């Protein structure tokens, strides 16, 4: 475009789309690790509950 | 609008905003979920700490 | 710009980019906290291994 403002807004939209995709990917990764943490903590509580006298 | 280029820009802007809102919600929920996981791990160690 | 549509698009594009930055920072914080939670759950199981 011959319009500087139009080129800038196009750049902003593209940069925003890419960043959003990356942020969602990272959020899902965090949720996966969060689940791993919860599962391992439950494992510890189960081992404690199943201890022999 | 009959300006084709302006229409494409409108579409790109709308998609970008929609995705940013989607990612903002995802990130907010994930931070909260991570705190819950931190609390769960802390509670497991607490049970080990308080056992006689 | 005397063109209202162009101004509105310029604003919306900048706002989307700012919101994406916010989401990036929050996602990064969540990954860090989740990792710390994983490490602490591992600490609990290690303590049990030594009993
Ligand atoms: Zn240009
Ligand atoms: Zn049109
Ligand atoms: Zn203007």
Swiss-Prot record, chain B:
Coiled coil (residue ranges): 6-52
Key word Ribonucleoprotein present: no
Membrane association type: Lipid-anchor; Peptidoglycan-anchor
Compartments it resides in: Cell outer membrane; Secreted, Cell wall
Keyword Secreted included in the entry's annotation: yes
Sequence-type repeats, residues: 3-13, 17-27
Cystine connections: none
UniProtKB keywords: Cell outer membrane, Cell wall, Coiled coil, Formylation, Lipoprotein, Membrane, Palmitate, Peptidoglycan-anchor, Repeat, Secreted, Signal
Gene Ontology CC entries for this record: cell outer membrane; extracellular region; membrane; outer membrane-bounded periplasmic space
GO biological process, one term: lipid modification
Molecular function GO labels: identical protein binding; lipid binding; peptidoglycan binding
Job of this protein: An outer membrane lipoprotein that controls the distance between the inner and outer membranes; adding residues to Lpp increases the width of the periplasm. The only protein known to be covalently linked to the peptidoglycan network (PGN). Also non-covalently binds the PGN. The link between the cell outer membrane and PGN contributes to the maintenance of the structural and functional integrity of the cell envelope, and maintains the correct distance between the PGN and the outer membrane.
Assembly notes: Homotrimer. Interacts with OmpA. Has been isolated from outer membrane preparations as an approximately 87 kDa complex, suggesting it also forms larger complexes. Seems to interact with TolB, Pal and TonB. In pull-down experiments interacts with CedA.
More about this protein: About one-third of Lpp is covalently bound to peptidoglycan.
Name of the molecule in the record: Major outer membrane lipoprotein Lpp
Species of provenance: Escherichia coli (strain K12)
Gene giving rise to this polypeptide: lpp
